[PDB]
C-alpha cells in the first residue's frame, strides 16, 4: 500500500550528507550502505533490522561486492583497501588490520571486473591507473603482482573521480554494451580482443577510458599514458555518475546507450546513428537538467533515477535518434544522494537528512464528498501560493521595463547624434548678496526634453572642481561634490539646483572653475563592484560669467 | 504529559510512538510502547507493534521527562531516546536515559542519580547527551564519559544546542559565546547583541566557513532570517508566547517553519515569502514526518483530550498542498478535480522555474549594461571614520593613478530606499601626500571625503 | 509612438537591448497574459533579411505548424517593430486555436462555485463533465417522462460571461443571461422551452410509433422531416411547421408516376377537409382516404443502393456497382463518382488502372479498377 | 506660482512630510479645508482706498491694498484679480477671496 517505507536513519550532520562519497548496494535481500563516515552497515531487507556493523578507521569512500565469492571490498581513505568475507563468524565489529590488502593509502577510487581489480591512485599532479590480479581460487584474499600502471597525464589536480567497467558482447559487477556502440567508442582493438574497458570520470570533468588488455607493464616496460588511456568527452563540470541503458526494450542486458552526469547537471548521453553518410556516427547530446545533481542510478527501460537538493526527479531516454530535451518529473521524494536501481522498478536510497527508505514505484455515499472537500481544500491550499508567485513575477517585470527605459536612454546618451537630446544640464552664473558680501552662485538646471522618465534608482552627482595643476602644497579643499536623488523626473520636466562657488574663506575665488554634472544608475534601489556613472556636460565658469557692472 | 498513568508522543521513521507508564499492580508501573502507523485505506493509525520495560523499585513518582530522536555516537543510527525520572520521596531523583532498538527492546546507558530535581532547558543531544540547568549552573552527562560535568562558563540562557562540522558539540546561550562540551570554549559572524535582548529561541539551518545562516523567534511575536547576521525577511506571528520552530519540506523548495506557541496554537510560515500560510488552534501536539509514505514531509496536528480519553482520535494530517486527511452520485466531477489539482501543481512548479528565469535575465542585462558603457585595480580600498558631526571617508590609491595628470574627486550617494525625499548631499575632498620612513621610496596618496552626519542618521541608519 | 525608440518600449516592454549597438535583444514577449523567452540577434546592421532568432522549447512547441510563416516574416518584413507585431498576433492566434491545453482558471471562484450551483440543482441532473471541466451536459424531464439533453461550454469565468448552451430541439433556444443569473437560470429557461414545444413532440412521437419512418433511423429531436413508407416502393416525405404542428405541412410523394398521380389528385380535392383540431394522422387518413402500413418491412427498411455521392440510381447508364469492403459501411458508389472523388484526396495513389484510397463514409481501404 | 508672470515649470516644494526628529522617532520605535473670513463696510473701504489708485472699485483694489507689501501685487494690479491661490512657507495651499 505505502509506495515508500522507512528502514533506518542515522547520525546526520547539519542539513545532511555531502555527495561524491556515500554508497548503497542491494545484493538479494542483503543490503550495503555507507554514510561516507567510518561505518559500513548491512541490513536484512525483510525486517529493516541490522545484520552487521563495521567500524573502519577513516571514512569509507566506496563499496563493491563480489557475490560468487561472498566478499565486500571497502576503501578507507588514508589507509588502503580492506576485504571482508560476508559470513564472518553489541552488533558492532571493528576491523582487524589482518584484512587490509595493498595499503597503497593514497588510492582514492577503485572498481572490480571478473577476477581483476582496478585502482586509480592519488599522487603529485599525475594520478595513475594501477591494475592488479585478484586470485580466482578460494585462498588467502591477496593482491598478487601489479600488472599495469599508467599516469592520467591530462589530470593535474570533496569530489572523488569515477571508474566504470564496460564489457563488449559475448564475454561481472559492470555494464555489457552492444557491439555497434563498443566498436564506435573504443575502436577495433577493444572490439577484437573483446577487452573490458574502464571509464574514468575525474573532477575536471574529463571522462577517460582505458582498455585493460593493453594495460600490462613492468619495470622494463613502462605504460605510456598518451597512447594507452583516452579521452571521450569533456563535461566542463565534474562527474558524478556514468552508466548504460536499455533504450528500445522490445540480468545481462545488451545495453544500447551511455550516460554521464555533471554536478550542476550537464547530462551527456551517447548512441549509434549509422546515418546520412551511409556510416556509423556517434549521437551526442549535452542536456542541462536542473540544479546540482547529487547522485544518479539507472532502472528498467531507459529511466535514470537522479536527485537535486529540491527533489528526486527522473529523465526517460526511451522515445532522428534519441531526443530534443529531458523535461523531468519528481516522484516527489527529497534530495536523496546515494541511489541504487535493482531491476525485477523498486529502488533504494539515502535521504539527505539521514535516512534509508525503499521507494517501490507503480464509489462512496458521502465519502466521495469528503474526497471533493479534500480536493478543493488542496486547490485552495495552492492558489494562495500561485497568487504570491504571480505578484513576484509582476515586480520582476516592472524592473525589466524600468531597466529597458534606462538602457534606451544610456544608449541615446552614449551616441553622438550631435544634440544631447534625451536629458540636458545647463549651468549658469548669478551674483547674489548674503549678509554683507556679494556671492557667486551657479544655478545648475537639469531638463528632460525626451519622452523618457528618469524614475527611481537614478541620481545626479555634481562636482565643483577648483583650479588645476596639483601643486607642491595640496590645498584644504581640492573639490566639493553634491549628490541628489532625481525621483520620477518625467518628460519636458526640469530641476534647478543652486550652488555657491564664491569666496567663503579669505576672499579667495580662483578661476577658472569647472562644474561637472554626471548621472549614476542604481541597480539595488528598484530591487566585484557594480553601478554605472554617465557623463552629462561640464561647464567652465570663467571671469566673463563672474563680472558684475 | 508527565505522570504515572500519562503518556508522551514522538515521531520515528514515518510513524508515531506512544510511551505510556501504566501501574501493573505484583509490582511497579511498566513502560508500554505502541509503535503506530497510518493506514490510508481505513484513514486511521493502526497498531503495528508494542513493547514493555518492567521497573523494579516500589517507589512512586515515575515520570517521562522528554523524548525525541538523537543518534547514538557508537553506531551513528537515529534512534528514539526517552528520559525517565525515578523519585523515592527521599529528595533523590534517578534520571535514567533508556534507548529503544529495531526490536522494540530497551537498553540502559545513564543512571546519573541526582538528589535535587532537574527542570528547565533539558535538551538531549547527539552522543546520547543530557544537558540541563538550575540557578545558572549548566551541567551535562555524556554516555561516553558517564560522569556529571559542569560547564565552566557563566550564561543566562542556552537557546540552541547541537553538533557542527569540524567541532563536534557546541552551545549558543549568549550570542557571542560559542562553547564546546569538553574543553569549555568562532563567535565572530553570529546575530547582533541588539537582538540578544529579544531572541528567546534560535534555530540554525546551515554552516559554512565561519558563516552560519540561521533563524530567530522573539517575545514580540516576530520571526526573522539572518545570512552572516544580516537580519533579512522578517514576518509577524499571530500568536503570543512563541516556543519553537521545526522545519518541513512539502516537496520541491516548499519549506515551512512550523512554529509552536505556549498558547497551544501553532503556525506554518511559508519560506519563499515570510508569510503566515496557515495557523491552527489548541493543538495538543505537532510532528513533522511522512506518515503516508509519499517521499516528502507533512505535519500532524493533534486536537485536545477533552474529545476522548484516547490520543490519536482528532488528528489532521497535511502537506498543506495536495494532501489533507481528518476524523446523489457526484463522482463525474472527481477526475476533473484531481486533474485540476495536478494541473495547479504543474502551474506552481512551472512558475517557480519562470521566476528564476526572470531574475537571471535581469542580472544578465545589468552586466550587459556594464560592458555596454565600457581590469587593473586603480584603488586599494575603502575605509571610514566618524570625527564629531563630520563623516570622513577615504581611500588608498595605487602607483598606476597619476594625480599629476588626473584631477580626481570623490562623492557620496545616498540610498533612496532609506531617503524617501531629496535632501541635497555635499562632500569636501582632500588629497593627502605623506612620505613613509624617509631617513623608489614610498609616498602614500590618500583621497577622502567630508560631510555632515546628523542629516544622514534620520533613519537610525543609512547605506 | 512613431519612432521604434519609444513605440518598441510601449509594444514590447520586456525586450532589453543587451549590446549598446542595439543588435542583441533578449527576454520576454507577451501574449494572452503569458511571457515568452526569445533571443533575437541582428547582424551589425538592422537587416532581418539575415538574422538569428532563437526560442525556448515552450515557444517552439506552441509555434509548431507556422515555422515557415515566421521564417518568411523575417525575410519580407521591413523593421523589428512590425516583425514583433506580426509575431505577437501570431502567438495570440496559436493559443486561442490550441485553447484545449491552456487554462489557468481562478479556482477560488470557479471550481468551488460550480460545485455550489450543481448542489443547488440536485445530483440526478448532470450527466457528463470533461476532466478539464470545460464541457458539461445535463438532463431534464418532460411531464411525459422524456429525457432531453443540453451541452454547455464554460469559459475561464463562468459567472462573468454567458456559458455557450448547445442543444437538440428544433427552434433556437434563447437565454436571458445576467452575471447574477446562474446554472438554475438557464436550466429554468430550458424547462420553459420543454413545456412550450410539447405538441410538436407528441405529433412526431405518434408518427414514429404508428408508421414506417424510413430515412431517419432512431431520429434525433431536431428532426422536422419524416419519410413515411406507405404501400410498397412508394414513399411520402412530410416536413412540419413547429409552432403550429397540427396545421398542414409541405407534403409530397416519391415513386412510380402511375402510382403517385391519384394520391396527388385526391390531396388537391380533399385538402379543404384538413382541420388543425385532430392529429396529422387523423387528418392524412381522411384526406388520402387510406390507412398506412405499420413497418411493412422493419429489418430491410431501406439500404439506399444509390451512389452515396450524388445519391441517385442510373447515372448515364452506370448503376451503383463499386462498394466498400466493410461490414459497417457497405455503401455502393458509381465508378465515375468514386474515381472523381478519390482523384482529389492526398491518401489515395494510382497503380496501372487501379486506385487505392479511403471510402468516403468510413475511411477504410477501398480499391477501384477502371 | 500658478498666477506668476513667467508661466514656467517650477517644481512643487511640498514642505517635508515630517520633522527629522519625528522620522527618527518613528524609525527608532517599531479632511476639510480650515476657513476664516471677515466682512467690512464698502464706505470704509472706499474712503480708505480713495487717493484712488485706479481700477474697479472694490474686491480687486481690496486685494491690491492687502498685498501692497508682497512682491506679487503689481501682476495682480494688471490682471485685476479678486481671488487667487498662493501656497505658504510650509507648502500648504491657501485660496483667499474678496
Ligand atoms: Zn453517381
Ligand atoms: Zn466504407
Curated annotation (Swiss-Prot), chain A:
> Where's it mainly located?
nucleus
Which superkingdom, per the lineage? Eukaryota
Q: Name one GO molecular function term.
A: DNA binding
Q: What are the GO BP annotations of this UniProt entry?
A: interstrand cross-link repair
The compartments listed are: Nucleus
Write out the entry's keywords from A to Z.
DNA damage, DNA repair, DNA-binding, Nucleus, Phosphoprotein
Q: Please provide, in alphabetical order, the Gene Ontology terms of the cellular component aspect for this entry.
A: chromatin; cytosol; Fanconi anaemia nuclear complex; nucleoplasm
Indicate the quaternary assembly: Belongs to the multisubunit FA complex composed of FANCA, FANCB, FANCC, FANCE, FANCF, FANCG, FANCL/PHF9, FANCM, FAAP24 and FAAP100. Forms a subcomplex with FANCB and FANCL.
What this protein is reported to do is described as:
Plays a role in Fanconi anemia-associated DNA damage response network. Regulates FANCD2 monoubiquitination and the stability of the FA core complex. Induces chromosomal instability as well as hypersensitivity to DNA cross-linking agents, when repressed.
Which protein is depicted? Fanconi anemia core complex-associated protein 100
Source organism of the structure = Homo sapiens (Human)
Lineage of source species: Eukaryota, Metazoa, Chordata, Craniata, Vertebrata
What is the gene name? FAAP100
Q: Report where the shown chain sits in the full-length sequence: first residue, last residue, total length.
A: 5 to 655 of 881
Curated annotation (Swiss-Prot), chain B:
Whether NAD counts among this entry's keywords is: no
Instruction: List the residue ranges forming a coiled coil, or say none.
Output: none
Q: Where in the cell is it found?
A: Nucleus
Main site of residence? nucleus
Cellular component annotations (GO), alphabetically ordered: chromatin; cytosol; Fanconi anaemia nuclear complex; nucleoplasm
Its GO biological process terms?
Answer: interstrand cross-link repair; negative regulation of double-strand break repair via homologous recombination; positive regulation of double-strand break repair via homologous recombination; replication-born double-strand break repair via sister chromatid exchange
The entry's keywords: Acetylation, DNA damage, DNA repair, Fanconi anemia, Nucleus
According to the entry, the disease involved is: Fanconi anemia complementation group B: A disorder affecting all bone marrow elements and resulting in anemia, leukopenia and thrombopenia. It is associated with cardiac, renal and limb malformations, dermal pigmentary changes, and a predisposition to the development of malignancies. At the cellular level it is associated with hypersensitivity to DNA-damaging agents, chromosomal instability (increased chromosome breakage) and defective DNA repair. Some severe FANCB cases manifest features of VACTERL syndrome with hydrocephalus.
Oligomer and partners: Belongs to the multisubunit FA complex composed of FANCA, FANCB, FANCC, FANCE, FANCF, FANCG, FANCL/PHF9 and FANCM. The complex is not found in FA patients.
Q: What does this protein do?
A: DNA repair protein required for FANCD2 ubiquitination.
What name goes with this protein?
A: Fanconi anemia group B protein
List the gene name: FANCB
From Swiss-Prot, chain C:
| Span of zinc fingers (RING-type) | 307-363
Mutating residue 359 to A has which effect? Abolishes ubiquitin ligase activity
- Please name the source species: Homo sapiens (Human)
Q: What is the effect of changing residue 265 to A?
A: Impairs interaction with FANCI and FANCD2
Q: Per the record, what are the reactions this protein catalyses?
A: S-ubiquitinyl-[E2 ubiquitin-conjugating enzyme]-L-cysteine + [acceptor protein]-L-lysine = [E2 ubiquitin-conjugating enzyme]-L-cysteine + N(6)-ubiquitinyl-[acceptor protein]-L-lysine
The protein's name in its UniProt record: E3 ubiquitin-protein ligase FANCL
> In the record, which positions carry N-acetylalanine?
2
Keyword rRNA-binding among UniProt keywords: no
EC number assigned by the record: 2.3.2.27
What domain of life does the UniProt record list for this protein's source?
Answer: Eukaryota
Q: How does it assemble?
A: Interacts with GGN. Belongs to the multisubunit FA complex composed of FANCA, FANCB, FANCC, FANCE, FANCF, FANCG, FANCL/PHF9 and FANCM. The complex is not found in FA patients. In complex with FANCF, FANCA and FANCG, but not with FANCC, nor FANCE, interacts with HES1; this interaction may be essential for the stability and nuclear localization of FA core complex proteins. Interacts with FANCI. Directly interacts (via the RING-type zinc finger) with UBE2T and UBE2W.
Record comment regarding domains: The UBC-RWD region (URD) region mediates interaction with FANCI and FANCD2.
Q: Which clinical disorder is mentioned?
A: Fanconi anemia complementation group L: A disorder affecting all bone marrow elements and resulting in anemia, leukopenia and thrombopenia. It is associated with cardiac, renal and limb malformations, dermal pigmentary changes, and a predisposition to the development of malignancies. At the cellular level it is associated with hypersensitivity to DNA-damaging agents, chromosomal instability (increased chromosome breakage) and defective DNA repair.
Protein residues bound to Zn(2+) 2: 324, 329, 359, 362
- InterPro entries listed in its UniProt record: Fancl, FANCL_C, FANCL_d2, FANCL_d3, FANCL_d3_sf, FancL_WD-rpt_cont_dom, UBQ-conjugating_enzyme/RWD, Znf_RING/FYVE/PHD
Report the CDD domains cross-referenced here.
Answer: DRWD-C_FANCL, DRWD-N_FANCL, ELF_FANCL, RING-CH-C4HC3_FANCL
Pathway the protein acts in: Protein modification; protein ubiquitination
Give the result of residue 341 to G, as annotated.
Abolishes interaction with UBE2T and ubiquitin ligase activity
Q: Which Pfam family, any one, appears in the UniProt record?
A: FANCL_C
Q: Name one GO cellular component term.
A: nuclear envelope
Amino acid at each position: 500500500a505505502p509506495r515508500v517505507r522507512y528502514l533506518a536513519g542515522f547520525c546526520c550532520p547539519l542539513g545532511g550528507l555531502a555527495a561524491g562519497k556515500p554508497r548503497v548496494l542491494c545484493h538479494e535481500a542483503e543490503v550495503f550502505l555507507s554514510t561516507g563516515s567510518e561505518l559500513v552497515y548491512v541490513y536484512d531487507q525483510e525486517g529493516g533490522l541490522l545484520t552487521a556493523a563495521f567500524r573502519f578507521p577513516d571514512q569509507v569512500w566506496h563499496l563493491e561486492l563480489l557475490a560468487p565469492r561472498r566478499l565486500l571490498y571497502a576503501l578507507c581513505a588514508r589507509r588502503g583497501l580492506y576485504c571482508l568475507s560476508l559470513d564472518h563468524p553489541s552488533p558492532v565489529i571493528p576491523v582487524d588490520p589482518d584484512a587490509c590488502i595493498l595499503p597503497d593509502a593514497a588510492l582514492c577510487a577503485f572498481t572490480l571486473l571478473d577476477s581483476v581489480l582496478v585502482t586509480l591512485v592519488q599522487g603529485p599532479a599525475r594520478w595513475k591507473m594501477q591494475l592488479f590480479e585478484q586470485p580466482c581460487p578460494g585462498e588467502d584474499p591477496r593482491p598478487g603482482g601489479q600488472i599495469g600502471e599508467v599516469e592520467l597525464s591530462s589530470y593535474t589536480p570533496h569530489f572523488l573521480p569515477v571508474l566504470c567497467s564496460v564489457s563488449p558482447s559475448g564475454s561481472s559487477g559492470g555494464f555489457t554494451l552492444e557491439d555497434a556502440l563498443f566498436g564506435l567508442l573504443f575502436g577495433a582493438d577493444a572490439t577484437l580482443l573483446q577487452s573490458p574497458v574502464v571509464l574514468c570520470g575525474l573532477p575536471d570533468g574529463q571522462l577517460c577510458c582505458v582498455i585493460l588488455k593493453a594495460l600490462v607493464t613492468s619495470r622494463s616496460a613502462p605504460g605510456d599514458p598518451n597512447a594507452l588511456v583516452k579521452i571521450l568527452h569533456h563535461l566542463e563540470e565534474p562527474v558524478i555518475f556514468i552508466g548504460a541503458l536499455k533504450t528500445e526494450p522490445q540480468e545481462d542486458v545488451h545495453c544500447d546507450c551511455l550516460v554521464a552526469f555533471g554536478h550542476h547537471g550537464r547530462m551527456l548521453a551517447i548512441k549509434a546513428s549509422w546515418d546520412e553518410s551511409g556510416k556509423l556516427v556517434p549521437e551526442l547530446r549535452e542536456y542541462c537538467l536542473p540544479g546540482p545533481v547529487l547522485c544518479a542510478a539507472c532502472g528498467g527501460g531507459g529511466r535514470v533515477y537522479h536527485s537535486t537538493p529540491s527533489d528526486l526527479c527522473v529523465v526517460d531516454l526511451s522515445r532522428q535518434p534519441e531526443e530534443g530535451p529531458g523535461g523531468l518529473p519528481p516522484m516527489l521524494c527529497p534530495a536523496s544522494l546515494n541511489i541504487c536501481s535493482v531491476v525485477s522498478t523498486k529502488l533504494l536510497a539515502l535521504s539527505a537528512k539521514g535516512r534509508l527508505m525503499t521507494c517501490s514505484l507503480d464509489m462512496t455515499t458521502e465519502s466521495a464528498g469528503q474526497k471533493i472537500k479534500e480536493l478543493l481544500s488542496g486547490i485552495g491550499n495552492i492558489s494562495e501560493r500561485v497568487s504570491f508567485l504571480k505578484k513576484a513575477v509582476d515586480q520582476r517585470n516592472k524592473a525589466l521595463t524600468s531597466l529597458n527605459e534606462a538602457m534606451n536612454v544610456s544608449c541615446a546618451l552614449l551616441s553622438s547624434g550631435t544634440g544631447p537630446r534625451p536629458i540636458s544640464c545647463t549651468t549658469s552664473t548669478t551674483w547674489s548678496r548674503l549678509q554683507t558680501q556679494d556671492v557667486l552662485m551657479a544655478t545648475c538646471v537639469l531638463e528632460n526634453s525626451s519622452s523618457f522618465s528618469l524614475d527611481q534608482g537614478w541620481t545626479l552627482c555634481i562636482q565643483v572642481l577648483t583650479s588645476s595643476c596639483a601643486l607642491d602644497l595640496d590645498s584644504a579643499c581640492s573639490a566639493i561634490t553634491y549628490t541628489i536623488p532625481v525621483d520620477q523626473l518625467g518628460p519636458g520636466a526640469r530641476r534647478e539646483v543652486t550652488l555657491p562657488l564664491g569666496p567663503g574663506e579669505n576672499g579667495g575665488l580662483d578661476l577658472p572653475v569647472t562644474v561637472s554634472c554626471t548621472l549614476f544608475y542604481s541597480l539595488r534601489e528598484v530591487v566585484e563592484q557594480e553601478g554605472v556613472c554617465l557623463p552629462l556636460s561640464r561647464h567652465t565658469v570663467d571671469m566673463l560669467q563672474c563680472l558684475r557692472f | 504529559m508527565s505522570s504515572n498513568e500519562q503518556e508522551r508522543l514522538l515521531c520515528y521513521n514515518g510513524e508515531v510512538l506512544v510511551f505510556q507508564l501504566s501501574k501493573g499492580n505484583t509490582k511497579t508501573p511498566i513502560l508500554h510502547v505502541r509503535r503506530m502507523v497510518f493506514d490510508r485505506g481505513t484513514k486511521v493509525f493502526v497498531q503495528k507493534s508494542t513493547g514493555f520495560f518492567t521497573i523494579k523499585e516500589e517507589n512512586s513518582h515515575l515520570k517521562i521527562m522528554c523524548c525525541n530522536c538523537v543518534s547514538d555516537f557508537r553506531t551513528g543510527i537515529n534512534l528514539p531516546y526517552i528520559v525517565i525520572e525515578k523519585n523515592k520521596k527521599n529528595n533523590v531523583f534517578e534520571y535514567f536515559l533508556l534507548i529503544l532498538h529495531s526490536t522494540n527492546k530497551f537498553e540502559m546507558r545513564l543512571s546519573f542519580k541526582l538528589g535535587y530535581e532537574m527542570k528547565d532547558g533539558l535538551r538531549v543531544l547527539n552522543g546520547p547527551l543530557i544537558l540541563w540547568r538550575h540557578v545558572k549552573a549548566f551541567f551535562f552527562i555524556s554516555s561516553q564519559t558517564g560522569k556529571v560535568v559542569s560547564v565552566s562558563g557563566n550564561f543566562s540562557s542556552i537557546q540552541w544546542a547541537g553538533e557542527i562540522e569540524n567541532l563536534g558539540m557546541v552551545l549558543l546561550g549568549l550570542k557571542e559565546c560559542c562553547l564546546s562540551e569538553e574543553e569549555c570554549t568562532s563567535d565572530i559572524y553570529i546575530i547582533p547583541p541588539a537582538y540578544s535582548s529579544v531572541v528567546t529561541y534560535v534555530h540554525i539551518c546551515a554552516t559554512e566557513i565561519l558563516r552560519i545562516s540561521l533563524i530567530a523567534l522573539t517575545r514580540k511575536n516576530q520571526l526573522i532570517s539572518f545570512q552572516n547576521g544580516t537580519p533579512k525577511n522578517v514576518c509577524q506571528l499571530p500568536f503570543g508566547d512563541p516556543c519553537a520552530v521545526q522545519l518541513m519540506d512539502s516537496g520541491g523548495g516548499n519549506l515551512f517553519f512550523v512554529v509552536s506557541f505556549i498558547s497551544n496554537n501553532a503556525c506554518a510560515v511559508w519560506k519563499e515569502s515570510f508569510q503566515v500560510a496557515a495557523k491552527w488552534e489548541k493543538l495538543s501536539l505537532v510532528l513533522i514526518d511522512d506518515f503516508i509514505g509519499s517521499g516528502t514531509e507533512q505535519v500532524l496536528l493533534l486536537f485536545k483530550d477533552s474529545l476522548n480519553s484516547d490520543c490519536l482520535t482528532s488528528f489532521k494530517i497535511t502537506d498543506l498542498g495536495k494532501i489533507n486527511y481528518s476524523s446523489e452520485n457526484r463522482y463525474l466531477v472527481v477526475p476533473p478535480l484531481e486533474t485540476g489539482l495536478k494541473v495547479c501543481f504543474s502551474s506552481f512548479r512551472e512558475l517557480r522555474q519562470h521566476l528564476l528565469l526572470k531574475e537571471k535575465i535581469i542580472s544578465k542585462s545589468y552586466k550587459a549594461l556594464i560592458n555596454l558603457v565600457q581590469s587593473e585595480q586603480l584603488v586599494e580600498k575603502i575605509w571610514y571614520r566618524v570625527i564629531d558631526d563630520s563623516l570622513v571617508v577615504g581611500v588608498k590609491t595605487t602607483s598606476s593613478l597619476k594625480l599629476s595628470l588626473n584631477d580626481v574627486t570623490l562623492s557620496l550617494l545616498m540610498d533612496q530606499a532609506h531617503d524617501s525625499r531629496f535632501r541635497l548631499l555635499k562632500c569636501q575632498n582632500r588629497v593627502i601626500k605623506l612620505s613613509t620612513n624617509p631617513f623608489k621610496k614610498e609616498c602614500v596618496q590618500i583621497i577622502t571625503a567630508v560631510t555632515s552626519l546628523s542629516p544622514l542618521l534620520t533613519f537610525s541608519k543609512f547605506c | 509612438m512613431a519612432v521604434t525608440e519609444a513605440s518598441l518600449l510601449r509594444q514590447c516592454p520586456l525586450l532589453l537591448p543587451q549590446n549598446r549597438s542595439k543588435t542583441v535583444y533578449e527576454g520576454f514577449i507577451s501574449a494572452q497574459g503569458r511571457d515568452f523567452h526569445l533571443r533575437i540577434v541582428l547582424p551589425e546592421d538592422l537587416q532581418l533579411k539575415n538574422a538569428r532568432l532563437l526560442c525556448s522549447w515552450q515557444l517552439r512547441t506552441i509555434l509548431s505548424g507556422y515555422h515557415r510563416i515566421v521564417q518568411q516574416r523575417m525575410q519580407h518584413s521591413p523593421d523589428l517593430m512590425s516583425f514583433m507585431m506580426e509575431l505577437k498576433m501570431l502567438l495570440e492566434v496559436a493559443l486561442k486555436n490550441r485553447q484545449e491545453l491552456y487554462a489557468l482558471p481562478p479556482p477560488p471562484q470557479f471550481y468551488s462555485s460550480l460545485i455550489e450551483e450543481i448542489g443547488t440543482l440536485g445530483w440526478d441532473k448532470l450527466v457528463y463533465a470533461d476532466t478539464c471541466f470545460s464541457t458539461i451536459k445535463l438532463k431534464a424531464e418532460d411531464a411525459s417522462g422524456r429525457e432531453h439533453l443540453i451541452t454547455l461550454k464554460l469559459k475561464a469565468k463562468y459567472p462573468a460571461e454567458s456559458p455557450d448552451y448547445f442543444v437538440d430541439f428544433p427552434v433556437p433556444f434563447c437565454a436571458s443571461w445576467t452575471p447574477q443569473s446562474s446554472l438554475i437560470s438557464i436550466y429554468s429557461q430550458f424547462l420553459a422551452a420543454i413545456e412550450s414545444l410539447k405538441a410538436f413532440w407528441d405529433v412526431m412521437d405518434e408518427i414514429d410509433e404508428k408508421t414506417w419512418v424510413l430515412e431517419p433511423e432512431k431520429p434525433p429531436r431536431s428532426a422536422t422531416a419524416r419519410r413515411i413508407a406507405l404501400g410498397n416502393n412508394v414513399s411520402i416525405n412530410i416536413e412540419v411547421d413547429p409552432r403550429h404542428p397540427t396545421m398542414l405541412p409541405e407534403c409530397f410523394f416519391l415513386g412510380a408516376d402511375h402510382v403517385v398521380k391519384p394520391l396527388g389528385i385526391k390531396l388537391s380535392r380533399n385538402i379543404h377537409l384538413w382541420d388543425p383540431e385532430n392529429s396529422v394522422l387523423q387528418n392524412l387518413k381522411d384526406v388520402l382516404e387510406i390507412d398506412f402500413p405499420a413497418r411493412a418491412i422493419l429489418e430491410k427498411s431501406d439500404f439506399t443502393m444509390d451512389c452515396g455521392i450524388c445519391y441517385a440510381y442510373q447515372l448515364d447508364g452506370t448503376i451503383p456497382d463499386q462498394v466498400c469492403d466493410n461490414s459497417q459501411c457497405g455503401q455502393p458508389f458509381h465508378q465515375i463518382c468514386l474515381y472523381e472523388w478519390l482523384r482529389g484526396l492526398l491518401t489515395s495513389r494510382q497503380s496501372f488502372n487501379i486506385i487505392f484510397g479511403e471510402c468516403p463514409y468510413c475511411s477504410k481501404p477501398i480499391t477501384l479498377k477502371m | 506660482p500658478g498666477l506668476a508672470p513667467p508661466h514656467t515649470r517650477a517644481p512643487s516644494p511640498l514642505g517635508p512630510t515630517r520633522d527629522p526628529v519625528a522620522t527618527f522617532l518613528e524609525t527608532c520605535r517599531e479632511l476639510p479645508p480650515s476657513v476664516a473670513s471677515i466682512k467690512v463696510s464698502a464706505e470704509l473701504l472706499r474712503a480708505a482706498l480713495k487717493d484712488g489708485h485706479s481700477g474697479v472699485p472694490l474686491c480687486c483694489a481690496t486685494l491690491q491694498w492687502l498685498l501692497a507689501e508682497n512682491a506679487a501685487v503689481d501682476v495682480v494690479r494688471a490682471r485685476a484679480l479678486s481671488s487667487i491661490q498662493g501656497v505658504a512657507p510650509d507648502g500648504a495651499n491657501v485660496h483667499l477671496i474678496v
